[PDB]
Amino acid sequence: TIVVDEDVRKNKLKPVATYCSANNPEISFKAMNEIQCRVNKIDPTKSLAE
Amino acid sequence: RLRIDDCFQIVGTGDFDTCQAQVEELLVSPRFPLPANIEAASSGFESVGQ
Numbered sequence: 001t002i003v004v005d006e007d008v009r010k011n012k013l014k015p016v017a018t019y020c021s022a023n024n025p026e027i028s029f030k031a032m033n034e035i036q037c038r039v040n041k042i043d044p045t046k047s048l049a050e
Numbered sequence: 051r052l053r054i055d056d057c058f059q060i061v062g063t064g065d066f067d068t069c070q071a072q073v074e075e076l077l078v079s080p081r082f083p084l085p086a087n088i089e090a091a092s093s094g095f096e097s098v099g100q
Contacts, residue, residue, distance in 0.1 A: 031082060
């Protein structure tokens with residue numbers, strides 16, 4: 001039975017999503033880096049769960 | 051690229067306060083600046099604000 005982990009830390013997308021967050025000062029740094037995260041479907045305005 | 055359509059005359063308003071404000075918004079710290087120069091002699095910043 002194929003089962004999927006719902007833990008945020010055991011998530012294939014956690015690394016990227018951690019980078020693409022308003023938390024990360026690299027995103028604050030470049031008002032332009034916030035766009036690339038949004039373009040690759042990972043909006044930092046949204047929470048980690050979103 | 052060099053043109054603005056439906057613009058015919060530029061008149062001066064000699065208003066330093068707005069000028070400063072615009073120079074600030076447009077040149078000194080734009081939100082989406084022109085691309086950085088990437089090279090050995092360059093640190094990597096894109097704007098004076100940064």
